[PDB]
Design an enzyme around this catalytic site. Structure first.
Site, short mmCIF file in Angstrom:
data_model
loop_
_atom_site.label_atom_id
_atom_site.label_comp_id
_atom_site.label_asym_id
_atom_site.label_seq_id
_atom_site.Cartn_x
_atom_site.Cartn_y
_atom_site.Cartn_z
N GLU B 98 -13.63 -10.13 -29.49
CA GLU B 98 -13.01 -9.80 -30.76
C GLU B 98 -12.32 -8.42 -30.73
OE1 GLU B 98 -16.15 -11.27 -30.39
OE2 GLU B 98 -15.30 -13.17 -31.00
N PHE B 174 -20.09 -22.18 -25.17
CA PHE B 174 -18.98 -21.43 -24.59
C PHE B 174 -19.36 -20.66 -23.35
CE2 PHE B 174 -14.85 -21.21 -26.68
CZ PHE B 174 -15.03 -22.17 -27.66
N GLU B 179 -17.65 -19.22 -20.28
CA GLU B 179 -17.98 -17.88 -19.82
C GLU B 179 -18.60 -17.69 -18.46
OE1 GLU B 179 -19.79 -16.71 -23.40
OE2 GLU B 179 -17.83 -16.36 -24.27
#
EC number: 3.2.2.-
Lengths: 250, 248
Positions: B98, B174, B179
């Site tokens: 983010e 994820f 990842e």
């Protein structure tokens, strides 16, 4: 000081972003559109000398950009920018000026006017002292005033009390000049949180030095007064950063 | 869902303010212009049906949005959004996705293409009307892989270990799907921090269950491994919001 590049754009983008996506739950949207917000901001410093300003230069911008603030959430900080903004939590625990539209759009930006077209200087802005305080404090002091003036309920002032060179409470500080003088009777209580930075030497105690001069002035101004130093929530917050601090054992 | 209003301006604006003012001391500036990034982004989805996307739709955008990431600072999280970000501290302690150009820009934004002009739907997007999961995971699946793939040195993966209903480590997520797999040889140690919520039950623990499968898995990958449950610092950040707590 080299000013912000593409001020128009940065400003308008921070304004659209905020508008469409920022403190949706927390704060109210403003009724002015970003472009209107830009004309008023820009008409304040443009085509004048960079030091050609006083507190009332941004009056029109602040009138347009002012949001009604959440009851009892308002916070003023001094000397503890991160600790205070980390504690307020994005409008979660409190709102600081930098969460309000104006604080958000202009936070960290450097801009100045000049007489020549484009109306502002994108190459260089004068240094600090060069300008008179009210030209130097034209934008942010006016933002505090406007912001202090919109507070209602309990108001929180978090301060550094581990600094031997700058006392927790000073008259010629934005708080003593812009925020406290602007608190209206919609304000019920001034709560101060004294920050004793972990590790370091405790300089200010509540009910003791300038925190005592403040205590009396606040009540003289008819507001109630509460003072605490390193309350637990702020202490843990402080420990997170220094787990192995003695104040933090357990 | 109702999709983001004025996408181009939110994008372009989150882009300009980031480029010019965000993470100046934490993350580099991408060389691509924000107008070029919008073009590459818009190209990935506009004028297709919202379910017509796959993990390669945004290749270009991500190729352009990609920043070199500070060594040892990359953190992956699961189930503990607020905690992980509070912990990371906007890029100072750790950097999350983010905080990068692409996650900063599209974070919380909703958007969808359509065949008809002008190519995207500003009025509504599918939610319950679900597309295959790779359509469903086109942006964030690719964001997570391109980012996992630029990580170097230590990598931290903060996970929630006080949720019966959903485990710490699952290959279905994820980290498992995007990842961990793309973690490169520049990576060295996978540090896991299990977050046991104050006043709740330790469902997961290190060395056991998922944490243990995930352990063998990293060890297989050839990365050093590590696991901690509520480290002090994390525990203090928890206490902050619950000073009154047995643990505090």
């Amino acid at each position: 000081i080299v000013p912000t590049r593409e001020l128009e754009n940065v400003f308008l983008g921070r304004c659209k972003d905020y508008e469409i996506t920022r403190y949706l739950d927390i704060l109210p949207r403003v009724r002015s559109d970003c472009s209107a917000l830009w004309k008023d901001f820009f008409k304040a410093f443009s085509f004048k000398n960079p030091c050609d300003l006083d507190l009332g230069s941004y009056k029109d911008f602040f009138t347009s950009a002012q949001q009604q603030l959440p009851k009892n959430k308002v916070m003023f900080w001094s000397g503890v920018y991160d600790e205070a903004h980390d504690y307020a939590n994005t409008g979660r625990k409190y709102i600081t000026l930098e969460d309000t539209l104006p604080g958000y759009m202009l936070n960290s930006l450097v801009w100045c006017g000049q007489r020549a077209n484009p109306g502002f200087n994108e190459k260089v802005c004068p240094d600090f002292k060069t300008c008179p305080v009210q030209a130097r404090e034209s934008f942010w002091g006016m933002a505090s005033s406007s912001y202090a003036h919109s507070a209602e309920g309990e108001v929180t002032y978090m301060v550094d009390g581990s600094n031997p060179k700058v006392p927790a409470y000073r008259p010629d500080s934005f708080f003593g000049k812009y925020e406290l003088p602007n608190l209206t009777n919609k304000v019920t209580r001034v709560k101060v949180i004294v920050l004793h930075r972990l590790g370091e030497k405790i300089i200010e105690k509540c009910g003791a030095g300038s925190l005592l001069d403040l205590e009396k002035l606040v009540k003289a101004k008819h507001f109630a007064f509460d003072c605490v130093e390193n309350p637990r929530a702020v202490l843990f917050l402080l420990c997170s950063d220094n787990p192995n601090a003695r104040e933090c054992r357990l």
